[PDB]
Amino acid sequence: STGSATTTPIDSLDDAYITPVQIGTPAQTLNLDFDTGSSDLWVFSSETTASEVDGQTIYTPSKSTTAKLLSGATWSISYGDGSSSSGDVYTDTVSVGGLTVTGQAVESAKKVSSSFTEDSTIDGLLGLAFSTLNTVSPTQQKTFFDNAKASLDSPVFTADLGYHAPGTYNFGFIDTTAYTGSITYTAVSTKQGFWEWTSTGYAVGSGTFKSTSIDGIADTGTTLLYLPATVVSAYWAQVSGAKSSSSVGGYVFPCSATLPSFTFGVGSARIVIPGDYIDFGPISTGSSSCFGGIQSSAGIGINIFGDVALKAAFVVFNGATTPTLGFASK
Secondary structure (H helix, E strand, O other): OOEEEEEEEOOOOOOOEEEEEEEOOOOEEEEEEEEOOOOOEEEOEOOOOHHHOOOOOOEOHHHOOOOEEEEEEEEEEEOOOOOEEEEEEEEEEEEEOOEEEEEEEEEEEEEEOHHHHOOOOOOEEEEOOOHHHOOOEOOOOOOHHHHHHHHOOOOEEEEEOOOOOOEEEEEOOOOOOOOOOOOEEEEOEOOOOOOEEEEEEEEEOOOOOEEEEEEEEEOOOOOOEEEOHHHHHHHHOOOOOOEEEOOOOEEEEEOOOOOOOEEEEEOOEEEEEOHHHHEEEEOOOOOOEEEEOEEEOOOOOOEEEOHHHHOOOEEEEEOOOOOEEEEEOO
């Protein structure tokens, strides 16, 4: 089997991407944030504290003839950006782009933190990291991908995120028309539950490539590119007027600037992030100070190849017995 679904930016800055997902019988379609940095499939639901729902589409398990409450199971998750959610668990039928899993754990939110409430466009998350990170207790549950894997033509899914445009998540096959040149594969550590890999270095604009190992995770659920302070300093040094602002919470730059590109290494291959991808617009409405899309990972504790990086590539998440990551230009 295979599946193929279109993923769409939630706003004009590509702050996140939503992908339609069918849950239950008859189908209830929710727009979920596919997140290769976590492993819970959770949804706004009929059980969510009413004051914490503001425009989201909810899953109502009582209206699904295939929904079954998973007795005694609960979940609770906290994300790197400080957001959180919790609730109970059903199993139900879940389909993505034509690909169907029966008995998928669907984590129904009773509580969500303010940032989820405030984002009416995201109805929940669909985790695609490794199932070892799944928070369901007392019996940990598997991800959609994990459940689908054995049925797939090939045990892979791919992320093809667009810049200010729709893109695609494919399951079970590699669309050879979706990228240019070849796919370079690179080793993955699953030790922390992430799609963790080591970049071979970077360049800023037309500058020479610096060979240096940068360990980080491929994380579709993180907006920005978080890299070591040395790297980030070298990037923003090429932007006139750029500075790190503690009050704003990262590097800012004059909105009139033309940003240089940023290149990262995948083995001997190179992925080029155009400068425009690194512009996240005015820090506040009407400001001529703009927020940078490359930020320091110091005090995150891990480097994160988020959407800013991944949307410059066609990315293969290879779930073979020994997982690997593939990157191609496009």
